């Protein structure tokens, strides 16, 4: 099917009409998304099939057709860009300065933007346009809002 580099919508026809369950990045013949979007199920791209290659429920990441290729990371200083791909709406870049998720295993980036759960998998970019992580896994704060972490995989 289509394996051109870029950002893609993850849809399903299992419910009423076509519903967007998430987003993903195609880079170097590998489609990268969040595990909670596809649950490790095979994906379709026209007549072609995309089979899972790597996945981890704790990291909440999954790769298709090959190993994880995205290796860039937030510098802890600069403003990033969430390339948001919302259900039924056109892709839109939103520049923001991330906060920090402080954990027992180290600090991670965190973008505080408000989008439907179906926006999960949309890439977060650095000034060079490099994917420094995926948007869609985080926490609910005091005002009911969602704050997502910047989730990156490991390149071997």
């Amino acid at each position: 099917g289509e394996t051109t580099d870029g950002v893609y919508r993850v849809m399903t026809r299992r419910l009423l009409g076509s519903t967007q369950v998430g987003v993903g990045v195609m880079q170097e013949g590998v489609f990268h998304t969040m595990w909670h979007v596809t649950k490790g199920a095979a994906l379709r791209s026209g007549e072609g099939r995309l089979d899972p290659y790597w996945g981890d429920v704790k990291q909440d990441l999954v790769s298709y057709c090959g190993p994880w290729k995205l290796d860039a990371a937030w510098d802890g200083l600069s403003e990033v860009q969430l390339l948001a791909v919302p259900p039924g709406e056109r892709a839109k870049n939103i520049q923001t300065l991330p906060g920090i998720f402080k954990t027992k295993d180290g600090d991670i980036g965190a973008v505080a933007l408000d989008y439907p759960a179906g926006t999960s998998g949309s890439p977060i970019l650095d000034k060079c346009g490099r994917v420094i992580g995926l948007y869609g896994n985080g926490v609910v704060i005091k005002n009911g809002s969602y704050v997502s972490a910047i989730t990156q995989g490991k390149r071997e």
Binding site: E2, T4, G6, V7, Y8, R9, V10, M11, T12, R13, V21, V23, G24, Q27, F31, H36, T38, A41, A42, L43, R44, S45, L50, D56, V57, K58, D60, E79, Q81, L83, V85, A91, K92, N93, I94, Q95, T96, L97, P98, G99, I100, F101, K102, T103, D105, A110, V111, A112, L113, P123, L125, K127, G129, V131, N137, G138, V139, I141, V147, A149
Partner: protein, 39 residues
């Protein structure tokens, strides 16, 4: 059965909408990859 559709190129766009705050949150990650606020 899930399927993918192209939604565009991945590039940084200058003069984009600049919004969102930067909060520092003490969190915990469980075995299921689910985050939770620590207090």
């Amino acid at each position: 059965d899930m399927y993918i559709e192209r939604a565009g190129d991945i590039t940084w766009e200058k003069d984009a909408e600049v919004t969102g705050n930067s909060p520092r949150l003490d969190v915990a990650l469980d075995e299921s990859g689910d985050f939770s606020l620590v207090e």
